[PDB]
């Protein structure tokens, strides 16, 4: 959706925007799992387990 420059990271040492980017990916990877289980209409047992 947006393309940012990597050369803005190592000069101004705001590494928190990389880790956030890696967490916001993981935090969305969970969402895309639930979005799958809600579209497969999995049981609430499996949804609750995950």
């Amino acid at each position: 959706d947006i393309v940012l420059n990597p050369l803005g990271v190592p000069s101004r040492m705001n590494i928190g925007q990389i880790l956030e980017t890696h967490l916001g990916m993981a935090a969305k990877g969970i969402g895309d799992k639930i979005n799958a289980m809600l579209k497969q209409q999995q049981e609430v047992a499996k949804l609750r387990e995950f």
Partner: protein, 1336 residues
Amino acid sequence: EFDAIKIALASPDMIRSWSFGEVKKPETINYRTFKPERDGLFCARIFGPVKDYECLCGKYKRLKHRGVICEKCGVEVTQTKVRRERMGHIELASPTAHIWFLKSLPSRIGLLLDMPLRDIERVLYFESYVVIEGGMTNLERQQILTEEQYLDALEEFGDEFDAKMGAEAIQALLKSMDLEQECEQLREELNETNSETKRKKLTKRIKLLEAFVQSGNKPEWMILTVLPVLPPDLRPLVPLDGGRFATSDLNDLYRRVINRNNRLKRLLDLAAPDIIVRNEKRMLQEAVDALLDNGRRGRAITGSNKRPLKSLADMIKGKQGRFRQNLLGKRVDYSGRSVITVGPYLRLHQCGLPKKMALELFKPFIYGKLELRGLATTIKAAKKMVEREEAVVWDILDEVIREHPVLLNRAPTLHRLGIQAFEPVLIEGKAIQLHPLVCAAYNADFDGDQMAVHVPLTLEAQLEARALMMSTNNILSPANGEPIIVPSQDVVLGLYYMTRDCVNAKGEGMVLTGPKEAERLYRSGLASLHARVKVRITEYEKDANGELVAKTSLKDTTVGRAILWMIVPKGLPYSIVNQALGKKAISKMLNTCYRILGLKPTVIFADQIMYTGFAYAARSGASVGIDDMVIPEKKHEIISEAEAEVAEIQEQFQSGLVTAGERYNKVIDIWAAANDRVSKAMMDNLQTETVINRDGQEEKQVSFNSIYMMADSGARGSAAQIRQLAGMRGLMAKPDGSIIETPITANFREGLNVLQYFISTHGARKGLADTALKTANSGYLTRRLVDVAQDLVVTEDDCGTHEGIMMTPVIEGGDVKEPLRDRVLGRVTAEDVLKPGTADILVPRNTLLHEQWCDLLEENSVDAVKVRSVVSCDTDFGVCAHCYGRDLARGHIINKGEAIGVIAAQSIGEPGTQLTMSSIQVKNKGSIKLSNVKSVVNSSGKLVITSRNTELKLIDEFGRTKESYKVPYGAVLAKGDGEQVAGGETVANWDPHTMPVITEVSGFVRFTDMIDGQTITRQTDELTGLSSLVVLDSAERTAGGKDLRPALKIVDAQGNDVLIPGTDMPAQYFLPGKAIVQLEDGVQISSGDTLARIPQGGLPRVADLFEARRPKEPAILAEISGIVSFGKETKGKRRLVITPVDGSDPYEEMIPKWRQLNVFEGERVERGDVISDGPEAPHDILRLRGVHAVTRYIVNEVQDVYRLQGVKINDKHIEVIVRQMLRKATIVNAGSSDFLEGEQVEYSRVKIANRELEANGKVGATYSRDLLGITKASLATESFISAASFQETTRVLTEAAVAGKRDELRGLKENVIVGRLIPAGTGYAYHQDRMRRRAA
């Protein structure tokens, strides 16, 4: 229309001459209906009609009778514009002292009456009497006598005297005195006084009186009896839409006057008691002074805001006065502003301009093209067609801006390249698109910056924008000859990624027919961008005849560099791309292309580089992730070792074996050592990869880590920040600067915990608060430099001079800081450069030393070149184009007409925001030489120097000096002269804490004036047990002990006198205080033995070198060359005496006693040698060693500040400032010229006067040139418009008023003020016609 500006005091009759009527009533307007009041501050009768061509009463309303005066009301039917030019006047009921000539130190009224200001202020404000005429009594003229001392004088001498008070008294004193007689009376008191402390005041007063009599002024004009009134359209009374009138400040300060004056005019007719008319005259005086300059008398008048009212003198001075706010820079039509955006598809000469902005800026051009093409018939019809934005308006607009440059400007315009002209490409957004390569020149980054766009209207302005200011003409920096259009941080990463190589890349080893096959192989996917490959490459070489010769051969390349060869123009070699191209390699590639091929191939090459770098950085996918910041696995070990060491230091402090000082210092030192080990382990882990080669073996290559590639390219960041991402942040500092002893052992990939982060914030906010407050210092220094140097222009092709400074490579110890090539590239030689094989001229006299001549200098290894410079240039009012050198931005000799002063000031003040706020170990191998030597061969055979200003240098195989050190007094060196040395050898040794006095020739020591207890103490220390003698100090003696000075002398074995070589004066060594001698009397000493021992930056540095400020404790220099002695003593100062062998001998120096005086009674000194150690004052350097030594000193001490931060500035730009500092001279002998003795004159004046006086064989004046700071030399110009617009405006205007000066508009600022073509550049050709058609 006019050729100069004259300024003087205004006669009362002249103020009535300006005036169009007397303002008698303080009423400004009528409140019922808003017409002006009769005789008010706004009056249509006096100041002209209120509407265009209509009378105030309506009886006349059209220009049929223009020029009439109405007779119902007296208003003349003319344009209302005359309300901006017609002045009024208030007839002051009593005289009133002008506050500028009373209070603007020195007080011209005080300096003219020879009367102290603290008493004239008392007489003027009606607190004391003064006697106009004395008469036959003790009532002398300038005597002040208080009122109670006056009424007793009412009877003592009757009414024979007349004493007065107030402005009437001072006006009577001024009007009564005679100038031509008073200056004649003072000229003999000045000529007769021998204490110059009074001669200072005498020549001050004589200068003032001669200035008053030479100009047409009269003294009694410094006391207003008529007050002019500014025209009413310049103090406008704006009607507010809120049903109100918003008043000016002057309209108060005038009304406040017109009341009190009027009130006084009643008390002079009601004959009110003289106490109350005294108080009313005092109020009128202070009201007129509050009008002219508010707050000069302390508490300033404030109206209705509890905020001081604005003066007349507050209108013209300061950052908000007319000069800086409205005259020297002004708001501008045909201009716009927007946010900038990258737009990398652009060509170097064009910029994206929004359609919505380019429709507004180019509006009258569009109206013209609409009326021309018949699409409209009237400017109103075309205005409607444009505001509707019909579809034909855009087709018009695409033509209106076809070849029409626009200027783009991003503030602050720190340097010349801050304004550049591009061709507009109409884009559809609202953001100005700006080519990526010009961002470095602008200092622009796209995080929200804005730019102003200005439109050149005239054909001359469009051609100036196209030929001088277009961005394809500005690819070299004017500060130094290095490219400013340099690929930056994405192009260097693209080309770094392209040009690199990997060991087993896809398609390695194959053989390619050329770059085209490499590109085909890459895009097909059949080979990697890094495949180490053999490509047949054809490269074109410039032969001596000028044309290109092709050479074809199979180069070992990668696929990437072969692909990049397709964009490299013909004349360049292949090795320019056969390497991993960092940032510096790319800027060097562009500089090589500019030097070999010229401007047009380079402007094409830069765009091709930008396009291909962006393309292959995109193809790269170069991305930063959290795994790229690889922390070395030794870190958690290395730290846990230093954490041990501090313990075994702390347990020593708890054991008390160390003090807090060395404990703290050793803890810091071991933490810095651990920091360096961590950063070294990090970088050694990070810069190397292991990859399997074609044979299946392992092999180490340079890493492809993204963080590392951005670091190694020079694209962004550096190992100093890769350290903080992957090493440890290391020791941080306190707010005061004392670095906290436990470091941040954590980096930004790990977390800084809350304490390490809090510590980090100290330095973070120090840096931010430093940046927020040093931009002010940098801008102020830039402005001072511009205003000292604005008027320097190149005005001549050659001044024909032969002198010039000697350029040598700077050497600060073991290493060169700048080679000769950096310091002579672009300069013209002053005298023949001949080969080290003597008398064979390597370079003729007047050549511009371009790159070819410079590498010719370096291969034949010449090391010192005499070079022409602006400080040595013979041209009057300007610089010749040869004494300047190269135009740095172009690369050829400088054009006649360049404003080199503004360029110098900008090139110096632009990097200002980047500045902040014992034996000698020879390093290299070479032949050692000694210079300025006074030496002896000691009894141990080794060399012992007994000079103080001798130096020790190293000479390589080629004859060039590679390193240089300073060998102090008493230094004993273990080598010989001319002796070849290897690396690391210590050559010279000395005692850093003591000076030994050295035997000249062998013989017996013999003590003279050595009476014990009175001059000497024989002592021994229980720790040493050895006997010694110490000479009694000044505190160790009473009167009678200072009288007898101890001494030693050498007496040979027959009891006869031995003589130091060179003269028959005896071999005496006079003993100083606290001289510690270990040796005994009667012993025979040898030549070379030590007789006795005597023990011992940033931006403000540049602002203090240019302001030529005297250091706190200056090094004392020897005033003349001669023989040292000490005449007399102890009245606070010891009187050194240098008696030469020739001329008038006696010279004296009252040197403070406490100052460590490193010279003795017997040795000689030359003119300007150091008598006492310390920082030299620049004035003394100039006085004693010439202008060349002071320009060399200032150039070197400024470049030591700039080189510390990596800043590059060609030092022409510094000499240009020094030339403007030492611009004044002082007459030491008048000669047959008209200048009086000791008077400071302009140097060009006295030099041309000497020229014309030697034209007829007479004697010409002689001078001592001065050195002034940039502020004092700015305020001492011949122009009062260049010095009144700079700063200190009231000083400059009062001194130019009482002097009657004349500004002849010869500078750049004077012509910017008045709206003329500056004499620089494309106005220069104009400004010469104006001279060659008006001087004839």
